Amino acid sequence: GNYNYLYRLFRKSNLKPFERDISTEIYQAGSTPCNGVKGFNCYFPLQSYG
Amino acid sequence: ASVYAWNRKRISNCVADYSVLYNSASFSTFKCYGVSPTKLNDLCFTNVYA
Numbered sequence: 001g002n003y004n005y006l007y008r009l010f011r012k013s014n015l016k017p018f019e020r021d022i023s024t025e026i027y028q029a030g031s032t033p034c035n036g037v038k039g040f041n042c043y044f045p046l047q048s049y050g
Numbered sequence: 051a052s053v054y055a056w057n058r059k060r061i062s063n064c065v066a067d068y069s070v071l072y073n074s075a076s077f078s079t080f081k082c083y084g085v086s087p088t089k090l091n092d093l094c095f096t097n098v099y100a
Binding site: 040 | 072086087088
C-alpha cells in the first residue's frame with residue numbers, strides 16, 4: 001500500500017471554489033478538549049487511500 | 051452470541067440519537083466506513099441493524 005497520497009477526511013466548513021487548505025491541526029470531532037493530542041474525538045485531519 | 055452465529059437487533063420506528071455513542075469514551079474503538087459518525091444525527095433510514 002502506497003501511503004504518500006492523502007485526502008482531508010473532515011473540516012469545520014466547506015471549501016470555497018479553488019480554495020486551497022494545507023493546515024494539519026488536530027480536528028476536535030466532539031466534546032473532548034483535544035489540546036493538539038491524538039485520542040477519542042481528537043484526530044489528525046488527513047487520511048490515505050494506501 | 052459466539053461470532054460464528056452473530057446476533058442482529060432490528061432498529062425501527064424510533065429516534066436514533068447517536069450522541070450518547072459519540073461521547074461513549076469507554077468504547078475501545080468506534081470506527082465508521084462510508085459515513086462520518088458525527089453526521090449520523092442528521093440522517094434518516096428505512097431499517098437500521100446492530
